[PDB]
Symmetry: D3
Subunit: 296 residues, 6 copies
């Protein structure tokens, strides 16, 4: 009697979708839906279920963008101010979490038994991977290539494989496209690493202190030199430093090394595609063009 359980208004949804709505107003090179469509050419998910799966994966991406941006101490997103630079860590991060739950509600519309178990094991692997990623960031422990690639097969594999596992579970075609999306996600990540140092903020995951792929090669190649790892430890907003670091990693030939690794990996993903295609699936031109876009 003393408390009248008030209803959820739309102004309060607006307040809660704000860091998210904001992120969704910023144009970006959406490659996630592109990956869904090019794999749909093989799966043929109905359009209602495929609509639902697209909605959820997009929500999850923007929500983890908010979160990870907070956790990375990132400054810029899609060229414009990073969400929490406007709404603050708290509000923006709770909004990340909120959209996670709203996406769970969404998944439930697929009204498929195995949907929730897949969504779960994906979130488990997401945070497994970015957990170790941080465990290394915070410890100044340079991992191995193999350690880095296992954590990537967790962290990026998470939403890539989520999109595809949901599709496989909503289709008629029982072909395991996930050992391919795993390779594609690993490649996309290595690519994202490389471009973060050689492209056109300038070297922003040096400021993050990340142990990215060419950073690991550079560090382990000559261990006797501890400038690069100390610059990782300094988390530098200065560009004199970041530029020195680019210098040192060039002097070690780690971008050469990374481009070679990307080359051999695109090779493995080509043979892995041509296998499926030569087991009776339509020639995928779309995924060829998409994989091609991963290069610089």
């Amino acid at each position: 009697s003393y408390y009248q359980r008030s209803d959820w208004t739309a102004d309060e949804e607006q307040i809660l979708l704000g860091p998210f709505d904001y992120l969704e107003s910023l144009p970006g090179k959406n490659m996630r839906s592109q990956l869904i469509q090019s794999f749909n050419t093989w799966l043929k998910v109905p359009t209602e279920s495929l609509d639902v799966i697209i909605k959820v994966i997009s929500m999850l991406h923007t929500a983890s963008l908010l979160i990870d941006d907070i956790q990375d101490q990132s400054i810029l997103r899609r060229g414009q101010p990073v969400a929490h630079s406007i709404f603050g860590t708290a509000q923006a991060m709770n909004s990340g979490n909120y959209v996670y739950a709203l996406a769970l509600r969404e998944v439930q519309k697929l009204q498929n038994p195995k949907a929730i178990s897949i969504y779960v094991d994906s979130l488990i692997d997401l945070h497994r991977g970015q957990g170790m990623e941080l465990f290394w960031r915070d410890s100044l422990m340079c991992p191995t290539e193999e350690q880095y690639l296992d954590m990537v097969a967790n962290k990026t594999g998470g939403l890539f494989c989520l999109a595809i596992q949901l599709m496989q579970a909503e289709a008629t075609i029982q072909v395991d496209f996930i050992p391919l999306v795993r390779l594609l996600g690993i490649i996309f990540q290595i690519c994202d690493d490389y471009l973060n140092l050689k492209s056109t903020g300038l070297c922003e995951d040096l400021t993050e202190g990340k142990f990215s792929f060419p950073i690991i090669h550079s560090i382990r190649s000559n261990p006797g030199n501890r400038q690069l790892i100390n610059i990782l430890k300094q988390k530098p907003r200065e560009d004199d430093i970041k530029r020195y670091a680019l210098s040192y990693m060039e002097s070690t030939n780690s971008f050469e090394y990374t481009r070679g690794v990307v080359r051999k990996l695109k090779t493995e993903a080509i043979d892995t595609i041509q296998g499926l295609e030569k087991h009776g699936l339509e020639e995928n031109i779309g995924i060829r063009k998409i994989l091609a876009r991963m290069s610089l």
Copy 2:
């Protein structure tokens, strides 16, 4: 091949649950599982489904602690350092969100469909709650009291009700328990509020830290709205004061406004409501529940 995918190891789990484990090696006030016992007097969920409901709420709660401690900018949890002052807010936050994943995975062990609707609707409401709380914090504009109470119904009711609704789900009795457990949650948070400012809490979660953090809490809302034309307290919240003198002044002011009396009397009326409701339930084919009122009485000052 080149990349050979390998398996998750136990050392790695230990790293992932490092903030959460820590936070759980810390003595707590047990008031989740106690309320579960209080209601299981009536619901009588089997011991196994109950063991799962209890791990799910224990998890979701410890995770909520890990994450709120960062969002609120808290200095001490359970009198000990917040986890993120040991692991850093990044690892503490990923460890929270990981454990949330772990609970969703665990709550499937019930193999109960309606349970996932319950779990979702809850997390949804929990975040609508913390969202309106944050929104009135960062905007430095005082809610009303009705607004505060709805926000609390969401935030703190969202896990009282999760536990009791999972129980109802695994039970078969057709009696709604949820208005009562919501009422208990609102009381728990009003009490929690008062106690943050008026119990030597001041050793567990710091000297009025609801002030350093800037929450518009129930007594703070009273004091602020009682003399609108006096801005010292709301301005004080703005300044998010780590300093003890400022918090002392705000406490003194808040006494001047007869706000702690107001709080006590509200919790009085609400406990009357909680009793009248236990009694109305009990009077309908249910057993005299004692622990359910032992706990309500252990919400008190």
Copy 3:
């Protein structure tokens, strides 16, 4: 006997006039004396009294420049380092206050009974207006247009109307030029607001957290969006953010809106001028050119 009351040396005046002297060495688009002269064409204050009134209004301007610069967390003044970036908040602010008192001493040379009451009611209105201006800055309460325009009719009206009220009180002509200087000051302020976001620091009153005229229109137009008001709350020294904010306020058409308001206001000030002129005063070409300079 133990204390010899020492005299005021010139080296100590030099120490005290320092933040002020500094500000007076920096070239600026002096529009204040221009406003005095163009109104003098109607008042004809003798040259001794007009000299005195010019001195005092100039002192008051530079002193409040010092003060307000401190209170705004401003960084640059007339392109060069803001006074307290050199002498510090304390010294510079006491020097503001010191010049306030020296100007009071000055006013006393007008040896007119009503001079002090006018100077007072002007300072009262000054701080009345900038008080509410801050009360809003600190509270994140977006005011109305009407609230903003009343506070401007205080805060800028203060020294504008001080110049003119002193002149009216030193002249023979008993015509109430103040309901016109009020409109002129309001216009000058709205103009100053607009130029602070669309001109050539870049958007520095976003960094100040101000609720300026186009900022208020932008915020109230869509309340459902709280990015701009949150960016006001973030007080951003970053330019990515300030530029986003310019973007959002363009997308709302608030510079269009402000230019329209300025247009209608210049209209009212033209009719308000033409009235006085068509009541037997010489055609003021100067104030026409001065009002014209307020536009961009």
Copy 4:
């Protein structure tokens, strides 16, 4: 029209006087109006003109507090938070400068011409005082003692003399009281100085805050200039130390320099001067004034 000018409202005054009101809900040592009573024994200004002189000095003083607390970077006024830790230095400063305007408006109620010359010349001197103080602070160069005393004559004498000169103005007796009241002001500040470092002040305005702030105060000037070749103390001021250990060390050092004895003895000679002067006045058609020496004696350690 478009813009319609409206009127100032009472809620708005409440906002403008929010820092000042606060600062005035704080218990003070009354030593302004007491000195006014001490002299009104002799001046016998009517009760109404005195009521105005007293509001003017009460205002100018509370405003001076609001503004000095920001300029000095002080942490506590009257044992309670500085106003600007509640309203922010911007509002606290505008509220100060507003009240200064309010006093100038009020001092016209005397309808006395010479009073405005008095009020001006005062504010002028007050700022020449705080100006030389700030100038020796920021330059980290020690004044002499004579230099310090002239600065104090300006800064702290500028409102003792404002009150007593407004009184003389509303009176008609042709006796200068001002050298005595200046002398009393210098004593008040030397005392104030010592007391900042040597009285459990340490609870009102913090543990030697004249150190955290870096004022070259009378005992600090003695200690610094006494052993020029030892830089620890002046360097300590430079470091503007919030830390208690550093202030403790500087206090210990300052004892080693027999600087607090020096202070006490100077205040002794000056009280002798103040008595001899009260006596010389009294001996010239004036009444034995007791409160005037009760207050001088209440300046003491």
Copy 5:
């Protein structure tokens, strides 16, 4: 000419030695010159050469304090402020490195060639010691115990051995004393370690400041390496905590690991080694030395 080179003045020396002098007006535990006496029982260096050896070690040590206080980021030396909180890390560092120059100039007074080889090899080792210490600090990677002990042999053995080796040099007895004095240095630092965390030190050099500074110290190395899979303590070091609650938690944890017992027992075995060695020396044409074991016993808990 234009430039006319002039001479160094005494006021200027006073400026150069301002941090060092300060740091020397601070009460110390004397344990350098005491160990010198302990050995001069055996070496019997003349009083004059000894006076020089003692000034050289007194200097090199006080300088090492000035400079380590900056490198470690320490808050208090000998319970009083670090010098660089009075003069600034720049002057404190130049004053340190100046005094090092002063010792090199002074150690020539011995007019002993082998002494410069000794002095060099020492400073060399001292910096190899502080270097590996810093290297394991900034990399946040725990040494082993053997690694820690070698680092200590360098850092803290480098001035025990400097004093005793200068003595051997000015003596003529052909007995190596250096393994024993190295052993004593390792004990001095293990003790120093324990004592930093377990003696009310907490008043001299702050509440576990070896924690705020992040040194991997002997008990910290034990606790960290004892449960590798538990990261709280090493992560705590990372956070370099000025806060008392965090240091309290790390201390409690470190007890849970039976690390202070481990320390005590190691210092037990090492004191056995130091005795057995004094006894083996003594048993070879040397005198029963008592002060040499009085000091070893005064290393104790």
Copy 6:
């Protein structure tokens, strides 16, 4: 028995030479060896001893670079990140000190009795000079020209005269080249001062708060103005301020003044050279070219 005194590995020398090795990988206008060679044309130190003296002076330079960079709050060294921006104040500074000791070990190879006394008196004078330099930095006491020139004859004279005194002590020629290297070092320093404000970080010893030669002239020329000394006190990373300061020092004609002082000083060093040469030494073309390089 419980402790096995382990040996010094090369990986640990690598750890300790790191801030130093780093500094030695950065190309710079090495003028120090140039000064040794051009004076060797007069001294003829054998090549073994001259090798040793070159090694030690180079080590001492890089080590004090590390140190002074820390003490100056410097940001950039030879265009690239300053050592402690990578390894931190502690490690880098201990590495400075370490190389000081390693250089002492080196000097010992000259196996000359007077080498150590010279090395000492040089370090004594080094820190004597930079001591007073700081004593003034920290006190906001502007020295005199004479005071500044005595401290420079300490601080820079230190390593210049160290190089030359070691050479004189290793040669056959007993001619006091030190009253000349003193003048050359003073000139090099004044030059370094001037170029730090008028060249191509921008005015970085204003940020350091230094009382450099033209800064002293500017400050003492008009004492009545305390903007420049207050900007020295503000230690400004902003460029608006540093640029204002350049403005003020131009308006005082202190770069004119410094160039004139440098002119008269190069005159004295020419006559001081021509004296030695006209006492029977080979015409030094090298030192003429070297002295010429000090000008801009």
